Design a protein around this ligand. Structure first.
Ligand SMILES: [Fe+3]
Length: 293
């Protein structure tokens, strides 16, 4: 069940335990949780930002530090834009705490993003029209999960077209023969040189290889099992993007919020990419891992 549909229409929705169960089981199994009626409204004063020219170098906001990046302009405009992204951070965070009480306080918010550039007009590694799991060369996770909340805020009713691929285990299996260990010492140099933020764990190395090799595998991109789904304007969806194979084909105006979650906070840690990779390669893939006696 690549997509599980939910009825919630409010960011302050109260959830029964049955729906909370459905959500966590689905999320952890690598489904997209889809909320067709959960719209994220904009203030009249924010409507001006529905314009791709605000991107100056893909605008980001760090709720932890209340800092906005990737955009230039007058102070008042940056203030408004920061307010928009801040509100998205707040609402998504509240919603996740209402929906996933099992995770308790283990949900750690990360960066908020506003994507006002049209997708259809968009290197092979960066081509997000190619199925991939999320892995960022400059930003290793150390095994932590990448959980994202997305909202289509297109004011012309245009959907956001995605493709959803096969389960992670199948993707990993398909690509296994192409995986290779890192060159000795190379990850340490990336760290010393500031190319990576923190040290790239072996887990991160392998997720990057899956991401990259998968994107270059043209036969796989073309022929692997995948479903095309249009997320309507005014909808929201929630995905472990390090586990769900995904690609975006068209659309414009998206808010996105990243959260991180430690593997030991999961209901079924064995389903995580970290544990699946550690099992497949029979080794510990993050050196900083906690040790269970
Ligand atoms: Fe992605």
């Amino acid at each position: 069940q690549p997509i599980i549909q939910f009825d919630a229409e409010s960011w302050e929705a109260e959830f029964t335990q049955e729906i909370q169960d459905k959500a966590i089981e689905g999320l952890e199994s690598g489904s997209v949780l889809f909320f067709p009626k959960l719209n994220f409204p904009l203030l009249t004063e924010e409507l001006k930002f529905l314009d791709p020219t605000w991107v100056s170098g893909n605008i980001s906001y760090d709720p932890r530090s209340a800092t906005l990046k990737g955009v230039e302009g007058k102070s008042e405009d940056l203030r408004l834009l920061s307010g928009l992204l801040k509100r998205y951070a707040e609402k998504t965070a509240a919603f996740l705490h209402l929906l996933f009480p099992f995770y308790g306080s283990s949900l750690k918010i990360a960066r908020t993003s506003f994507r006002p550039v049209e997708i259809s007009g968009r290197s092979a590694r960066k081509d997000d029209t190619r199925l991939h799991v999320d892995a960022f060369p400059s930003s290793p996770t150390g095994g932590e999960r990448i959980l994202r909340v997305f909202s289509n805020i297109n004011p012309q009713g245009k959907p956001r077209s995605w493709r959803i691929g096969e389960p992670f285990q199948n993707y990993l299996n398909h690509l296994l023969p192409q995986l290779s260990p890192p060159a000795p010492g190379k990850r340490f140099l990336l760290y010393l040189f500031g190319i990576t933020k923190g040290y790239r764990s072996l887990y991160d190395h392998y997720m990057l290889e899956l991401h990259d090799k998968g994107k270059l595998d043209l036969e796989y991109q073309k022929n692997s099992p995948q479903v095309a789904f249009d997320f309507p304007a005014g909808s929201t969806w929630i995905v472990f993007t390090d586990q769900v194979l995904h690609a975006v084909d068209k659309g414009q105006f998206l808010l996105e919020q990243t959260f991180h979650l430690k593997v030991n906070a999961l209901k079924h840690p064995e389903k995580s990419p970290l544990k699946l990779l550690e099992t497949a390669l029979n080794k510990k893939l993050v050196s900083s891992e906690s040790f269970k006696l």
